[PDB]
mmCIF file of C-alpha atoms and ligand atoms in Angstrom:
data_model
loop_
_atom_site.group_PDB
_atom_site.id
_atom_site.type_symbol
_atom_site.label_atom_id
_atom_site.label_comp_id
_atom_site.label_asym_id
_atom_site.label_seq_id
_atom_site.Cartn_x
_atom_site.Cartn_y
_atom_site.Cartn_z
ATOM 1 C CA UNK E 1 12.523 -26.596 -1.185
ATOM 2 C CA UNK E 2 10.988 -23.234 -1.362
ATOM 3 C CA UNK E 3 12.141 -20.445 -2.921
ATOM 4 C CA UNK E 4 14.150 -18.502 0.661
ATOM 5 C CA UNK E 5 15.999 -15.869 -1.411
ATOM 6 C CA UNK E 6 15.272 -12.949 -4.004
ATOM 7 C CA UNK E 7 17.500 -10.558 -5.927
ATOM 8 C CA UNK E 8 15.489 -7.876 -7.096
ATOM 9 C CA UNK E 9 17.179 -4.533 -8.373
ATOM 10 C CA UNK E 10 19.967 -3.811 -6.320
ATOM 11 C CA UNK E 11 18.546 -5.656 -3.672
ATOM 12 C CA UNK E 12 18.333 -9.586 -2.237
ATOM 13 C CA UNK E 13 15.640 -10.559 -0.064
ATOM 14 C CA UNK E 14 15.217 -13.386 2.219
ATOM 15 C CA UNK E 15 11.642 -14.824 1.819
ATOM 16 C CA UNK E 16 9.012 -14.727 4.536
ATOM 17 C CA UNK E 17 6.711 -17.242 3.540
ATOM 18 C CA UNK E 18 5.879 -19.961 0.654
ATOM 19 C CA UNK E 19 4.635 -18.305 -2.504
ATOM 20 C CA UNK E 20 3.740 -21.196 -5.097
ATOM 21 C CA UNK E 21 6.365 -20.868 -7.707
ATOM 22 C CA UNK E 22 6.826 -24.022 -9.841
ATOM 23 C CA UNK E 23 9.023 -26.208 -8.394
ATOM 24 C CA UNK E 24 11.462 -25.790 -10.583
ATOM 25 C CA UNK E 25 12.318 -22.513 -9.397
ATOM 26 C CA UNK E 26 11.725 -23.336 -5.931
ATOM 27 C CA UNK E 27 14.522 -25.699 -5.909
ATOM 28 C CA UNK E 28 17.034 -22.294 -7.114
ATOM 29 C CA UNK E 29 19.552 -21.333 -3.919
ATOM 30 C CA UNK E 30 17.733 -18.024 -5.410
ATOM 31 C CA UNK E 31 14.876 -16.683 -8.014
ATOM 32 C CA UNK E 32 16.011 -13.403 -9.728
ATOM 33 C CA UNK E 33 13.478 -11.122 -10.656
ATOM 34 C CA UNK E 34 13.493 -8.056 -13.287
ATOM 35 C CA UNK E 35 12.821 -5.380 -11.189
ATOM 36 C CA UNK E 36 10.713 -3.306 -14.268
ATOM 37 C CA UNK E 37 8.517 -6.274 -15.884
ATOM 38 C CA UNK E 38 8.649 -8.599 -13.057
ATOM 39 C CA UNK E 39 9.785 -11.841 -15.309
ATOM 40 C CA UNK E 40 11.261 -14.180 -12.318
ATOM 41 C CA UNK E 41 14.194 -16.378 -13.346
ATOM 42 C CA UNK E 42 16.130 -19.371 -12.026
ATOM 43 C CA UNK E 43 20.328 -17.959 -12.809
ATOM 44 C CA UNK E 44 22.108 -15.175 -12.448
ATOM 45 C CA UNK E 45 22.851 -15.911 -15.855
ATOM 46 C CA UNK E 46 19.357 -15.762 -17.585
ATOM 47 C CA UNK E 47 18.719 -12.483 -14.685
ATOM 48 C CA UNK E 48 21.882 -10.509 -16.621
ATOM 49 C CA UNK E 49 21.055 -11.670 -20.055
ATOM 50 C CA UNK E 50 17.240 -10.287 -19.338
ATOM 51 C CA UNK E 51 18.663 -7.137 -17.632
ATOM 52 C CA UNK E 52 20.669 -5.850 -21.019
ATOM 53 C CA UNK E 53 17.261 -6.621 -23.325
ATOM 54 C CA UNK E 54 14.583 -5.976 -21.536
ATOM 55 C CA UNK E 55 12.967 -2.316 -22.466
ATOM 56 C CA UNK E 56 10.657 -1.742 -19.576
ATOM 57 C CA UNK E 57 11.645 1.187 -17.534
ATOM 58 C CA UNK E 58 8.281 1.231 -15.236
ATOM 59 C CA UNK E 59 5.282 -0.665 -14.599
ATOM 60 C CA UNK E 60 2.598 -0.644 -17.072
ATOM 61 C CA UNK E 61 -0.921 0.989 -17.425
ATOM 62 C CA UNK E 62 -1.404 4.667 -16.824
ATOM 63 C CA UNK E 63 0.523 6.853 -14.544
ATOM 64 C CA UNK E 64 -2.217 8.129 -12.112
ATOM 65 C CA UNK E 65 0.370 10.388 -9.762
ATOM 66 C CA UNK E 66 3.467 11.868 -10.568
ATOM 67 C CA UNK E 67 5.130 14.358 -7.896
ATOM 68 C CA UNK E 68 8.802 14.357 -8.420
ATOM 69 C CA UNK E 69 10.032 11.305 -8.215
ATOM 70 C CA UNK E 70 6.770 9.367 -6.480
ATOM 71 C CA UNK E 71 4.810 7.888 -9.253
ATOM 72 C CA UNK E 72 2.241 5.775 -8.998
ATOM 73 C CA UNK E 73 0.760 3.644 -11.771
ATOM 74 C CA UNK E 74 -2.979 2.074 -12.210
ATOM 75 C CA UNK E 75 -2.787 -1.785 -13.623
ATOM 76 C CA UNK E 76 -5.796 -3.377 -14.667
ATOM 77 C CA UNK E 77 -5.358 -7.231 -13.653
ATOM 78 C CA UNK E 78 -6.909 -8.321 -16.529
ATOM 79 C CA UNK E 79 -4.975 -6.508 -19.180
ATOM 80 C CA UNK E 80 -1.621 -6.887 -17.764
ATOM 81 C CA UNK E 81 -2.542 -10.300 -16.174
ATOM 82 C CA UNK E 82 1.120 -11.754 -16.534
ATOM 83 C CA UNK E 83 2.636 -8.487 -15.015
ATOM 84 C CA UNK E 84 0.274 -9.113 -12.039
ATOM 85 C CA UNK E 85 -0.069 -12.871 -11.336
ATOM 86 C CA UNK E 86 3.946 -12.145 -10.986
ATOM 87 C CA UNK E 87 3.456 -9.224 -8.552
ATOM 88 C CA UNK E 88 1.058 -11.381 -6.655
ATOM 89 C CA UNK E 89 3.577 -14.180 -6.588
ATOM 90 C CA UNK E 90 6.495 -11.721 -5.534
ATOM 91 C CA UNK E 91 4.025 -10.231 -2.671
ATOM 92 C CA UNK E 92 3.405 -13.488 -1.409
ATOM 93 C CA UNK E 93 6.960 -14.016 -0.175
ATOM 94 C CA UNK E 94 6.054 -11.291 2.268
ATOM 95 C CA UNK E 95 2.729 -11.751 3.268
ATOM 96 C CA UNK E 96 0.463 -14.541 4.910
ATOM 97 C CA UNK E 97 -2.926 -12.997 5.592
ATOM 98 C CA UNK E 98 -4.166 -13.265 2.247
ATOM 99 C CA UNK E 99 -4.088 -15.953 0.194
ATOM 100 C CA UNK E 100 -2.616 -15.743 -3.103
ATOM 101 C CA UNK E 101 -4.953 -14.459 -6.004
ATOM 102 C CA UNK E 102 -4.700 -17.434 -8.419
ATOM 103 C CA UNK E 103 -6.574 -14.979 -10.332
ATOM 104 C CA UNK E 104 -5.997 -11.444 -10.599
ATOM 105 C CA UNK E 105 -8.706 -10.340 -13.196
ATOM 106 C CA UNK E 106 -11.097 -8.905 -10.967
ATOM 107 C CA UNK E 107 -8.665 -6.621 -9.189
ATOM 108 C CA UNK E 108 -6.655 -3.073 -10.361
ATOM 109 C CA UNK E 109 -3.146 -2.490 -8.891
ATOM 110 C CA UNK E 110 -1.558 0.383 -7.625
ATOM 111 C CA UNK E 111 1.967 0.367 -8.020
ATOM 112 C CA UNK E 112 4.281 2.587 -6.198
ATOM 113 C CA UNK E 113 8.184 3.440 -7.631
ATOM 114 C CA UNK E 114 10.538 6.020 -6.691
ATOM 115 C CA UNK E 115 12.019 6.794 -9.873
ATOM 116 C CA UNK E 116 15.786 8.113 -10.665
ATOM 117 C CA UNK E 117 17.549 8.351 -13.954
ATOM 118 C CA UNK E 118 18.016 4.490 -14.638
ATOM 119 C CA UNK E 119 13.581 4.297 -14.435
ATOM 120 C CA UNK E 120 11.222 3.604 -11.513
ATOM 121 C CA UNK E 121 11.660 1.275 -9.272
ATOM 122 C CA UNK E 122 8.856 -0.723 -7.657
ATOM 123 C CA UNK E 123 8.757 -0.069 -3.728
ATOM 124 C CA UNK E 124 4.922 -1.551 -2.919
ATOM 125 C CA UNK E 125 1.829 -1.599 -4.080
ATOM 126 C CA UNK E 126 -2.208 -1.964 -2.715
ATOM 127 C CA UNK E 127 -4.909 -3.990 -4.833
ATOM 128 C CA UNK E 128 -8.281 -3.533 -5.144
ATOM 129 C CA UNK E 129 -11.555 -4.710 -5.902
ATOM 130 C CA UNK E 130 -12.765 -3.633 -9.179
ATOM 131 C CA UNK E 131 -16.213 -3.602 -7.578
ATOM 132 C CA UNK E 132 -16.051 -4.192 -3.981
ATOM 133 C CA UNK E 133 -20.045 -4.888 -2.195
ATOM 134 C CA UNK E 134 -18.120 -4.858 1.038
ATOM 135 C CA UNK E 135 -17.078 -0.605 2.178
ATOM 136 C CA UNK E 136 -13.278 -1.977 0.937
ATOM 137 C CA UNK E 137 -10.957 0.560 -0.498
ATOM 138 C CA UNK E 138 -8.108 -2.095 -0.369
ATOM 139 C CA UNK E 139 -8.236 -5.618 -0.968
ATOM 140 C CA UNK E 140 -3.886 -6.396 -0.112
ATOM 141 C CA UNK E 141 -1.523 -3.723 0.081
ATOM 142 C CA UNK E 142 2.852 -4.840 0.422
ATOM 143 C CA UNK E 143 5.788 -2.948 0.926
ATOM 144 C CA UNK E 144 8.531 -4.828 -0.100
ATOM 145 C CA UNK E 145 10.838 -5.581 3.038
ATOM 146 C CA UNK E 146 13.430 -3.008 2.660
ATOM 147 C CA UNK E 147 11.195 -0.488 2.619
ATOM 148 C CA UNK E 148 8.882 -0.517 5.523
ATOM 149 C CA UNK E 149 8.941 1.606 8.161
ATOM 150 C CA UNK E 150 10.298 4.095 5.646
ATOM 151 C CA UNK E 151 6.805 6.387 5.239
ATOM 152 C CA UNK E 152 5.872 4.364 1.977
ATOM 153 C CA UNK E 153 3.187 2.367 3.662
ATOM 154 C CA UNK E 154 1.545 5.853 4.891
ATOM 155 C CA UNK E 155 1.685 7.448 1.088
ATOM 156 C CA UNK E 156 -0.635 4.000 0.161
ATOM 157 C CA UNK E 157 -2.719 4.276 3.043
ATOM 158 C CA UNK E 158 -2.772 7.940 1.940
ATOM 159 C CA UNK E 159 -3.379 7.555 -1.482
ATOM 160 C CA UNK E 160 -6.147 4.556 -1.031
ATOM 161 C CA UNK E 161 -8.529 7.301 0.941
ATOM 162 C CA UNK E 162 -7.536 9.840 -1.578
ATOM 163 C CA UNK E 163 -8.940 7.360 -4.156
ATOM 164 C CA UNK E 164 -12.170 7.133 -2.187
ATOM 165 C CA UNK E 165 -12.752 10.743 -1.454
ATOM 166 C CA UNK E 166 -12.620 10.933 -5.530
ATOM 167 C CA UNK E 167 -15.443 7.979 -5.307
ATOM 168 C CA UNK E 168 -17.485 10.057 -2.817
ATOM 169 C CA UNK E 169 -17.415 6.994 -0.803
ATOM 170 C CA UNK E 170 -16.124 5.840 2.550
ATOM 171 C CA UNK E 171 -13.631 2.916 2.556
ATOM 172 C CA UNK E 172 -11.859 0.326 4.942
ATOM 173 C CA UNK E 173 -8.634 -1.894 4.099
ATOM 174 C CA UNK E 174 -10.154 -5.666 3.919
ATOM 175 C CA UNK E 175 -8.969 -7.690 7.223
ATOM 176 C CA UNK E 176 -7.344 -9.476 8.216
ATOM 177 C CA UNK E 177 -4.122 -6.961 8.462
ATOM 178 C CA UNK E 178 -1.054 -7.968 9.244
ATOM 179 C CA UNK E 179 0.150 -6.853 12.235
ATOM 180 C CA UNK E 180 2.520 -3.900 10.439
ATOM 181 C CA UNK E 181 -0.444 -3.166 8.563
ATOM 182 C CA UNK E 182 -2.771 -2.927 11.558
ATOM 183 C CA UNK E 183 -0.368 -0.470 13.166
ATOM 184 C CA UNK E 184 0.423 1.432 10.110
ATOM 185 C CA UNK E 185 -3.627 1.707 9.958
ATOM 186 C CA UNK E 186 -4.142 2.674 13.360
ATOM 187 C CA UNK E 187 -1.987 5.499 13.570
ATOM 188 C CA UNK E 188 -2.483 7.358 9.697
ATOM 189 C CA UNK E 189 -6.301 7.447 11.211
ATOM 190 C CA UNK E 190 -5.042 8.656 14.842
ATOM 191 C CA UNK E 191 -2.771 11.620 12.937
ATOM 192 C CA UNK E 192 -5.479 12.507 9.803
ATOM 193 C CA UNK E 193 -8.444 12.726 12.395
ATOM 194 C CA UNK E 194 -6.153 14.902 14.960
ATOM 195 C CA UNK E 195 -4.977 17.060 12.447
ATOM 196 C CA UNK E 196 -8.892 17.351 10.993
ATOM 197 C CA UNK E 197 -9.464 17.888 14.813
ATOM 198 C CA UNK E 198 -6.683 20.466 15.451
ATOM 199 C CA UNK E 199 -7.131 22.679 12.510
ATOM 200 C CA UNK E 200 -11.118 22.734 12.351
ATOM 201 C CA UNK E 201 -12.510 26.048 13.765
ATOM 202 C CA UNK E 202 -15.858 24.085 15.032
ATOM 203 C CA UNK E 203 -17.422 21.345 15.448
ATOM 204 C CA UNK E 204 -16.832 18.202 13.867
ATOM 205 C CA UNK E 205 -19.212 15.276 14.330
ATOM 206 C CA UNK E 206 -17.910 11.481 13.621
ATOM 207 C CA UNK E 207 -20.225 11.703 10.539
ATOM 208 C CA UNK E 208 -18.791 14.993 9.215
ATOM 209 C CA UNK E 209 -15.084 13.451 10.096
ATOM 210 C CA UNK E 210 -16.122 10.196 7.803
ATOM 211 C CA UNK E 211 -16.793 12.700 4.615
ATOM 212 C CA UNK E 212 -14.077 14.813 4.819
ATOM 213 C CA UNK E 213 -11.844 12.046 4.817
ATOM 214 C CA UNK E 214 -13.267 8.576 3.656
ATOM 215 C CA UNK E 215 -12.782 6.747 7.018
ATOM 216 C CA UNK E 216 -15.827 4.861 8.216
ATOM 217 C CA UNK E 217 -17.490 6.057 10.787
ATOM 218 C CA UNK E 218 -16.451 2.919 12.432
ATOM 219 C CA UNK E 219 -12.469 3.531 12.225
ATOM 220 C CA UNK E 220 -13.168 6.626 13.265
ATOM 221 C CA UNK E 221 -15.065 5.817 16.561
ATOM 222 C CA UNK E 222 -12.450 3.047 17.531
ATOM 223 C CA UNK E 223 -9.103 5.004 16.583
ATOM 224 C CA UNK E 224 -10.983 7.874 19.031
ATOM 225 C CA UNK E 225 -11.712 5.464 21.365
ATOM 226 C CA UNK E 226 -8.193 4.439 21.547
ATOM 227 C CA UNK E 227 -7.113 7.794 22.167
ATOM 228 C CA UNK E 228 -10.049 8.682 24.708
ATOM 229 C CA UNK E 229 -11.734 11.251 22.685
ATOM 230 C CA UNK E 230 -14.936 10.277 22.394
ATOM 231 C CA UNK E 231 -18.351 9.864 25.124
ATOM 232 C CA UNK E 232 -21.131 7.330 24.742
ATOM 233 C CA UNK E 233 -24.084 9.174 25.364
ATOM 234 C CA UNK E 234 -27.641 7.477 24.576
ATOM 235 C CA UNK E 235 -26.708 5.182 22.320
ATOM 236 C CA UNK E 236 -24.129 7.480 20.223
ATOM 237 C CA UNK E 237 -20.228 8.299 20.333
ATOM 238 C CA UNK E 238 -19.657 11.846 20.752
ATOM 239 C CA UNK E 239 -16.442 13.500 20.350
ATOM 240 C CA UNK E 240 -15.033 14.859 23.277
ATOM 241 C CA UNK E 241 -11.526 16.581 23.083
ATOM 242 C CA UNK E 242 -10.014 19.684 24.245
ATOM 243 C CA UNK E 243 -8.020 21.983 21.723
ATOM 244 C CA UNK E 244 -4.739 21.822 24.211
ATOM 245 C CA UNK E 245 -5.179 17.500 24.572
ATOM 246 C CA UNK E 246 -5.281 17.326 20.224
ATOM 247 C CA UNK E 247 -1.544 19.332 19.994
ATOM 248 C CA UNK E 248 -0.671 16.829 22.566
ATOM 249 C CA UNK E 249 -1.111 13.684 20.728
ATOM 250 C CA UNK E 250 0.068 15.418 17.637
ATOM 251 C CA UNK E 251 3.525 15.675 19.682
ATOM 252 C CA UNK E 252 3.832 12.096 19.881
ATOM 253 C CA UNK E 253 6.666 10.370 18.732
ATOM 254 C CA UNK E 254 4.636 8.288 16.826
ATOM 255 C CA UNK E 255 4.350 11.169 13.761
ATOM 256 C CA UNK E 256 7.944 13.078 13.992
ATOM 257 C CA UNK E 257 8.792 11.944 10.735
ATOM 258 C CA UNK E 258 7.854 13.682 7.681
ATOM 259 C CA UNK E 259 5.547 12.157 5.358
ATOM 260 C CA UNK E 260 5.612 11.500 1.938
ATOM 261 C CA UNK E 261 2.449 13.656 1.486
ATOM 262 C CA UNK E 262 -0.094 12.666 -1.606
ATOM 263 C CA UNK E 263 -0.557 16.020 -3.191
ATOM 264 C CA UNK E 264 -4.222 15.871 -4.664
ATOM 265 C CA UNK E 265 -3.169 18.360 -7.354
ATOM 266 C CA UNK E 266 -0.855 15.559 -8.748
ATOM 267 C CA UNK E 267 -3.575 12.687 -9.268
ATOM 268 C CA UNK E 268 -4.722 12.294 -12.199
ATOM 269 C CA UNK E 269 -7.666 9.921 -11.721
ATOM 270 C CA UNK E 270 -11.234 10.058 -12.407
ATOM 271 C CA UNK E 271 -14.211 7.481 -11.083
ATOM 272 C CA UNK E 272 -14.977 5.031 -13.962
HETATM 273 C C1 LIG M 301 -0.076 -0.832 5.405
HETATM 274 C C2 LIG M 301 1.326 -1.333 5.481
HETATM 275 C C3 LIG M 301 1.646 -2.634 5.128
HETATM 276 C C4 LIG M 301 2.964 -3.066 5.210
HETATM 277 C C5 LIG M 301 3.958 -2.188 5.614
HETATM 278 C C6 LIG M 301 3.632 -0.883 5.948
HETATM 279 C C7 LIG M 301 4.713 0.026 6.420
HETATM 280 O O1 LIG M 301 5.845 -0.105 5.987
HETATM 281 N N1 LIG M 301 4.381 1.011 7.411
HETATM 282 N N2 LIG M 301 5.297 1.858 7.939
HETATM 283 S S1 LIG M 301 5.235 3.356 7.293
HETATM 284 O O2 LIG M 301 4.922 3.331 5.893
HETATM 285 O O3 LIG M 301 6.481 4.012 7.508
HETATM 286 C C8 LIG M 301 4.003 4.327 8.099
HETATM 287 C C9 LIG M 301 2.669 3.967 7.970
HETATM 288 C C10 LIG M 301 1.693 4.738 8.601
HETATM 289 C C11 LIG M 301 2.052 5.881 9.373
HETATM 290 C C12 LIG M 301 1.031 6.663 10.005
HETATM 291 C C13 LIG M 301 1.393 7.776 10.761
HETATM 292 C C14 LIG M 301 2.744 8.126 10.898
HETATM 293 C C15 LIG M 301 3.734 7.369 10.270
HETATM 294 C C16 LIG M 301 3.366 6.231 9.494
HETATM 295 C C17 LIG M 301 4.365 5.448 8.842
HETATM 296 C C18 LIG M 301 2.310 -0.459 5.881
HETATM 297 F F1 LIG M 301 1.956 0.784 6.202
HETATM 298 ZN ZN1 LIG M 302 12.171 -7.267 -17.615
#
């Protein structure tokens, strides 16, 4: 048996996939996990005994954002390897295009919570490469079920590129994505390139969209050529889009819901 059932929080779970716990937690009707240190346990009984001793109120490492209550915190795999194999293991249940990092050292976490008066509380989180050869700005990225769809996915995408800008470097999410992922991809670069479009008194070239906002210039050219703004014209794309055709697409359904916006003022990061 496989471990089919989480209680996390306030919240239970049902599993998506295998994620290789020992067996002997596998075999549980149910693993319980501390929602602050991420310590996964086999009874309800050892879960409540944990929850009235444990001290941790948010992840560990440094809080890189803080704008009310969206904090983010950076995790170095290999100083807080424990607190990550465990994330790793818990992301696992929920995700089958990566395989799980049996080692975690070479990777830094970003850890999202929303954060009230009991202490922040882990939503989702992206990974990445501590040096990456490949152009990849994240390695995994998992929103816990219960929260997708729910504009936390967008503040990672977000906050990945925001990460890159600071690197004065373009970036792309390693593939495969899952198939969430490739749509929550797909339209953060249709609405960030529109808007750049929109509000841009000029003319903006594929190259000058890829600095201002850390999308490759190949993102760029197929999220255009999904919405039929670009020509092909001796061997280059060329953006072609009228002012009144932009506002259209910005109608869309697709981004009536307000974000949860990264405010760059907030981030408190700097490129080792
Ligand atoms: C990468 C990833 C992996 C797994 C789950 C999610 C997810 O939950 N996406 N939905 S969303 O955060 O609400 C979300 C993403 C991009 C958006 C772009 C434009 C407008 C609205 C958006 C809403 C995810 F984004
Ligand atoms: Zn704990």
């Amino acid at each position: 048996k496989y471990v089919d059932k989480i209680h996390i929080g306030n919240y239970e779970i049902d599993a998506w996939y295998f994620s290789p716990f020992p067996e002997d937690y596998g075999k549980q009707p149910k693993l319980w996990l501390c929602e602050y240190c991420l310590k996964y346990m086999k009874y309800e009984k050892s879960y409540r005994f944990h929850l009235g001793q444990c001290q941790w109120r948010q992840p560990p490492g440094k809080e890189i954002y803080r704008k009310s209550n969206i904090s983010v915190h950076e995790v170095d795999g290999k100083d807080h390897k424990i607190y990550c194999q465990n994330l790793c293991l818990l992301a696992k249940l929920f995700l089958d295009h990566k395989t799980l990092y049996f080692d975690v050292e070479p990777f830094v976490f970003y850890i999202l919570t929303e954060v009230d008066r009991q202490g922040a509380h882990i939503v989702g989180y992206f990974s990445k490469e501590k040096e990456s050869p490949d152009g990849n700005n994240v390695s995994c990225i998992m929103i816990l079920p219960p929260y997708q769809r729910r504009g936390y996915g967008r503040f990672l995408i977000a906050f990945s590129y925001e990460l890159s800008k600071l690197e004065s470097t373009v970036g792309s999410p390693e593939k495969p994505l899952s198939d969430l992922g490739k749509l929550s991809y797909r339209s953060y670069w249709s609405w960030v390139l529109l808007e750049n479009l929109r509000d841009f008194r000029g003319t903006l070239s594929i190259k000058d969209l890829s600095q201002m906002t850390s999308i490759t210039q190949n993102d760029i050219i197929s999220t255009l050529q999904s919405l039929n703004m670009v020509k092909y014209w001796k061997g280059q794309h060329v953006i072609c889009v009228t002012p009144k055709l932009v506002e259209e697409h910005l109608k869309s359904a697709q981004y009536k819901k307000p974000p949860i916006t990264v405010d760059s003022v907030c981030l408190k990061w700097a490129p080792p």
